[PDB]
Symmetry: D2
Subunit: 171 residues, 4 copies
């Protein structure tokens, strides 16, 4: 034999190990419209109808947004928009209520409950009405047979919805 001494400068004692990390995908939609009927005297919603253009999704990453539109997700060719239609607002108090409505994602419809939190019914500087309010709720992918090819392991069955609204009186 013969003896050698490492050259530490071009020697590497290395390892690779595989681990999982959980993270929230958080996105909005740039293009949607709604119809908002609300009675400040009784702090009750009368009509709330939303339509969201699936095309306009934004999860802060343009290449994933495209992927969202494909058949294993949105199918935005066949189903260009998702819709919400209020069927019932059950008041809790003047700040709080339980909105029940029909959500449709890619042609499938389920009734959902959103939690309404009224964040200040003012009369804005110009003398015309404003309202702020939020809608919050959890829907299950499986209820809408959504992304069915993707397992509940890789991607959560639960989707959390936060809708934040400022809004001004009509005409």
């Amino acid at each position: 034999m013969k003896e050698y001494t490492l050259d530490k400068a071009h020697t590497d004692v290395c390892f690779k190990i595989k681990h999982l990390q959980i993270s929230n995908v958080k996105g909005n939609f740039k293009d949607y419209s709604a119809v908002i009927d609300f009675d400040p005297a009784s702090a009750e919603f009368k009509k709330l109808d939303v339509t969201i253009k699936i095309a306009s999704v934004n999860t802060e990453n343009q290449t994933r947004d495209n992927h969202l539109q494909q058949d294993d997700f949105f199918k935005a060719k066949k189903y260009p928009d998702m819709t919400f239609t209020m069927k019932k607002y059950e008041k809790i108090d003047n700040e709080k209520g339980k909105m029940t409505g029909t959500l449709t994602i890619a042609g499938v419809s389920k009734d959902i409950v959103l939690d309404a939190e009224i964040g200040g019914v003012a009369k804005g500087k110009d003398g015309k009405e404003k309202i702020g309010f939020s809608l919050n709720g959890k829907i299950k992918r499986s209820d809408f047979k959504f992304a069915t090819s993707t397992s509940t392991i890789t991607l959560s069955d639960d989707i959390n919805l936060n809708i934040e609204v400022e809004a001004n009186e009509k005409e």
Copy 2:
């Protein structure tokens, strides 16, 4: 009631969904030493003994390195170094062989097989010998009862070892 029109500038239609991502943690060690006996005439290793100071770990993130030293991993207070001791080199050809040795991590010892790939036995510019070679192999965390508190789900049971060596003749 009253009708409102969204102000799109301070309205947000948002969602959060939880997904998993797999990734390789890849690290070296800055401080280790070895004893290398190798016969270029027969391209056979005679003795290979490595000691790695656990303290010197580097997974490109100083806060995780600290965590590695703690009780749920290395226990580098009690067990400051990990060691490898060659017990057998079985030649395949002049470029290849199967090294069997004793690895000890935090006081526990198992016999492992590394795959030796001899990357060029030259005689360097100064007239003194050099060798390059790599050692590769997979060890299982569970074999060394390592990180036992962390599940094989979050972090892989398999650790991949790549050792890259350049080395110069002694005296």
Copy 3:
């Protein structure tokens, strides 16, 4: 060389591959007590106080139940019971309301919302009152710094609570 023909009877062409499966752990508690004040005239809860002996857990598997009592979960030596204390019942209608209360698990307390669904206020055969009702809600392990050693990956951050009650008038 020489040629051979497999004996199919003592030959096996085998593979192993590792996969994940999600599943619900579903358990009750055999021993708990509560204080129930409820006004059938207005279908409103007045007081609801529950205490559950952690010791009495049952997830249909006696060896996991023991494990639940240990330091990485319940710590039932130090914290033998978990408690719920109603702070507010906000009526939705005669069948529905939103109960807010203080839940304590292993010494830590958070305010939670349960969904009350009143399932029939009858007067039982003997002339004395009965009520049926359910309480449902989701709590997050992380809110109670519960099982903190176990990742949100292996075990879900979300715990779903279903409390089913039949109950009879006092004295």
Copy 4:
């Protein structure tokens, strides 16, 4: 109000929580054939060619076996068999060697290394030759662009192959 006392017999204090579990899927194949050339004088394989009918898979569960044949796995309509072809046997000793060959799964081919362990070259009762031996190795799904729709998270990238053989001399 009015006071009530739980009826413990029709009251349930329940929870559901979601957890992951890892497990090995372990299967064989009932129908395959091979060509085996082996020289007991030098304990070296000369030719080893295997063909496995994908149709004949068995993971101890008939409904998963069917699923294996579908487009997101085997595609056994289009690709009815998988094949292994020895290209090189590099001897380690009389009990051990490193077999390199071409594996094809659903039309895609990669060179793999199996670990040969010769388990006893006897001459059976009738005066004709027998051999026992095993082949072991790990292949990566990703190398064969196999099950590409299924994530490396749900199902492991690594497949472990164990081939166990008894075999008798020809004619």
